[PDB]
């Protein structure tokens, strides 16, 4: 386990013949209101475009997933709500340890008057994506699929 680089949000290490990128854990928040899902968009230098995502962010020191979920929802959309843990996933275990904890937010309230808030029906997000109009982040796709599977009724 030798380190070739230690950065702000990631470290580059070598474990045998395996190239490994250590990355802080993350959270993502799925929120539905009046049939629209709360997506967010922002320029992502890594991909040169703004994919459709859902409120998300890295967990800060001393913070647990639930608290991070609350903070990101508030900082990115100015909203607060009743959060429930859903499930988690490793974004790409073949090379990084980034783990994302996904939450559901209900009974949204505006607590606060670079990130674009994009309320959109999940059916419309899926269609636009299928048309090649917009790209998805893993969190955005997860939100869309979760909705079609458990939030239509």
For Zn ion, the binding residues (CB under 5 A) are: 57
Rule CB under 8 A: say whether 66 interacts with a second copy.
no
Q: Within 10 Å of residue 31's Cβ, how many Cβ atoms?
A: 23
Residues 24-83 that bind ligand APR (CB under 6 A): 26, 56-58
The answer to whether 47 touches 122, Cβ cutoff 8 Å, is no
Is 94 known as a binding-site position?
Answer: yes
Question: Which of 20/151 has CB closer to ligand APR?
Answer: 20
Strands (E), 62-130: 79-90, 99-110, 116-120
Residue of 1, 2, 5, 8 that binds ligand APR (CB under 6 A): 8
- The residue of the chain with the least Cβ separation from Zn ion equals 57
**Cα dihedral 57, 59, 60, 64 sign:** positive
Phi first, then psi: what are they for 67, rounded to 5°? Answer: -70, -40
Across-strand partners of 23? Answer: 10
Q: Which stretch binds ligand APR (CB under 6 A): 31-39, 77-85, 95-103, 143-151?
A: 95-103
Residue of 43, 82, 84, 93 that binds ligand APR (CB under 6 A): 93
Is 44 known as a binding-site position?
Answer: yes
| Breaks after residues in the chain, judged by C–N over 2.5 Å | 113
Pairing of β 10-15 and β 18-23: antiparallel
Rule CB under 6 A: say whether 95 interacts with ligand APR.
yes
Rule CB under 8 A: say whether 53 interacts with a second copy.
yes
Q: Which residues contact 107 (CB under 8 A, 6 or more apart)?
A: 81, 82
Number of residues in contact with ligand APR, rule: CB under 6 A? 16
Binding residue numbers for AMP = 19, 44, 94
Enumerate binding residues for ligand APR (CB under 6 A): 8-9, 17-20, 26, 56-58, 92-95, 98, 100
């Amino acid at each position: 386990r030798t380190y070739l680089y230690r950065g702000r949000i990631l470290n580059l290490a070598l474990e045998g013949r395996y190239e490994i990128v250590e990355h802080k854990p993350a959270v993502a928040v799925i929120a539905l209101r009046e049939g629209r899902m709360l997506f967010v968009r922002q320029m992502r230098p890594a991909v040169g475009l703004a994919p459709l995502e859902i409120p998300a962010g890295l967990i800060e020191p001393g913070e647990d997933p639930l608290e991070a979920a609350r903070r990101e929802l508030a900082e990115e959309t100015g909203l607060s709500g009743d959060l429930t843990y859903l499930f988690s996933y490793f974004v790409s275990p073949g090379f990084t340890d980034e783990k994302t904890h996904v939450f559901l937010a209900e009974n949204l309230k505006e607590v606060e008057a670079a990130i674009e808030v994009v309320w959109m029906r999940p059916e419309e997000a899926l269609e636009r994506h299928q048309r090649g109009e917009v790209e998805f982040s893993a969190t955005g796709l997860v939100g869309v699929l979760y909705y079609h599977a458990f939030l239509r009724g």
